[PDB]
């Protein structure tokens, strides 16, 4: 089934040979051990985290502020743990969940810094030549959270 080397004889993309599974698994173990040792020795500075809260994903870091568009049924100044942390990343390494990281790995903590109402939003409907005109004002409840700390544990 040999084909002389022409423009269309071979695919236009480079041939990629993936590493053999056994050696690659050993390499993964080595890399995971290295990152775990970094976590053990605390060789990281700021930690950021993609956390799924409410219905959205927030890129978060310590001292950050987040504006949830609804009341959370929590007293102001109350401390909370954000549990759906999709990603935790540092200067030299990042950990990705599938799709969520375990509780033992990451601990994102926040505090209900404020409870407020949004500025009046105007909902106007209008249709020409139909005497159809309506106006409504809505103030969506909101909660400001401050992210206090992001902790990781050597549980890889």
């Amino acid at each position: 089934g040999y084909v002389p080397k022409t423009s269309l004889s071979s695919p236009p993309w480079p041939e990629v040979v993936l590493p053999d599974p056994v050696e690659e698994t050993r390499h993964h173990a080595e890399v995971v051990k290295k990152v775990n040792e970094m976590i053990v020795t605390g060789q990281y500075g700021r930690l950021f985290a993609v956390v799924h809260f409410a219905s959205r994903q927030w890129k978060v870091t310590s001292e950050d502020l987040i504006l949830i568009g609804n009341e959370l049924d929590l007293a102001c100044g109350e401390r909370i743990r954000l549990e759906k942390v999709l990603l935790v990343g540092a200067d030299n390494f990042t950990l990705l969940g599938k799709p969520l990281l375990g509780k033992d790995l990451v601990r994102v903590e926040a505090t209900v810094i404020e409870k407020t109402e949004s500025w009046p939003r105007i909902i106007m409907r209008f249709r020409k030549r139909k005497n159809f005109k309506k106006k409504r004002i809505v103030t969506t409840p909101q909660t400001v959270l401050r992210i206090n700390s992001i902790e990781i544990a050597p549980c890889l």
Binding site: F53, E78, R79, I80, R81, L82, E83, K84, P99, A110
Partner: protein, 85 residues
Amino acid sequence: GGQWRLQQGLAANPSGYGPLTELPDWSYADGRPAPPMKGQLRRKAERETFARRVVLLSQEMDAGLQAWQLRQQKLQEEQRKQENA
């Protein structure tokens, strides 16, 4: 990636059923679980009603088949019993 998610057996929409949307969003720093989310409660109620309807329909169809079988048995046994003379 709706098609791939369907192939793997997950919801086509990641916002659908699964750990990402079913699990509680948060809990108290102490460790106490948070009160169930309104969406989670609504979803649980809807799923319970769906399961109850599934059970009701299955039971009704099974009872109908059993009743039909009993009717056939009664008709045949009666027509046989008529042979008495």
